[PDB]
Amino acid sequence: MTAELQQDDAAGAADGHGSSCQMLLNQLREITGIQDPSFLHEALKASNGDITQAVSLLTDERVKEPSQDTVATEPSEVEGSAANKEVLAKVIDLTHDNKDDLQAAIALSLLESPKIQADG
């Protein structure tokens, strides 16, 4: 009934980390300061396990509130990918008759049909 010796003797098993140390979320929480292990683990899941990138993914639009309208800005539930950016190209055309293709086809068919058509 004295003190203990040899700490290598251990007592029993000591696993259950299954690729997922506290350094991942710890650091993450130290970089971003987020309290949503879910959105955090999301970043780690998107960065393929990389913290720096993940971080990037988050600091680059993490929480806030897009989708919905909120704020004063405009909502973004659709378009949001490449566009005239990656390339401005020529054939400039915005004013006058623009997108008249779908606007016209849509209008001609929208004028005869109900309103919303969703995916259809």
Side-chain angles (χ1 to χ4, degrees):
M1 46 178 187
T2 191
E4 58 200 48
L5 29 293
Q6 201 95 14
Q7 198 159 274
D8 225 278
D9 273 333
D15 69 74
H17 60 359
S19 230
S20 38
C21 12
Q22 38 165 249
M23 64 201 223
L24 296 157
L25 31 154
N26 170 188
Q27 285 263 144
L28 224 311
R29 249 158 33 239
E30 284 188 40
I31 308 155
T32 86
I34 309 257
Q35 4 167 67
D36 185 25
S38 252
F39 133 116
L40 283 112
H41 208 83
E42 178 181 273
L44 278 308
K45 150 267 175 310
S47 267
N48 317 149
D50 244 84
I51 236 163
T52 292
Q53 287 289 321
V55 148
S56 204
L57 317 185
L58 309 167
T59 113
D60 206 73
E61 206 205 290
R62 26 163 193 293
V63 187
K64 285 152 74 193
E65 239 306 0
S67 285
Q68 267 169 89
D69 291 33
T70 64
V71 201
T73 341
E74 52 157 299
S76 302
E77 306 230 76
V78 199
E79 297 152 301
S81 342
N84 285 228
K85 200 206 165 84
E86 220 92 50
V87 174
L88 178 117
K90 221 93 289 192
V91 196
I92 45 186
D93 183 352
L94 37 132
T95 10
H96 193 250
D97 67 330
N98 28 91
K99 97 209 75 128
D100 214 43
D101 230 326
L102 58 90
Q103 231 277 68
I106 293 272
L108 228 167
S109 246
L110 166 59
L111 253 287
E112 270 190 297
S113 233
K115 272 280 249 294
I116 354 188
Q117 64 213 69
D119 211 323

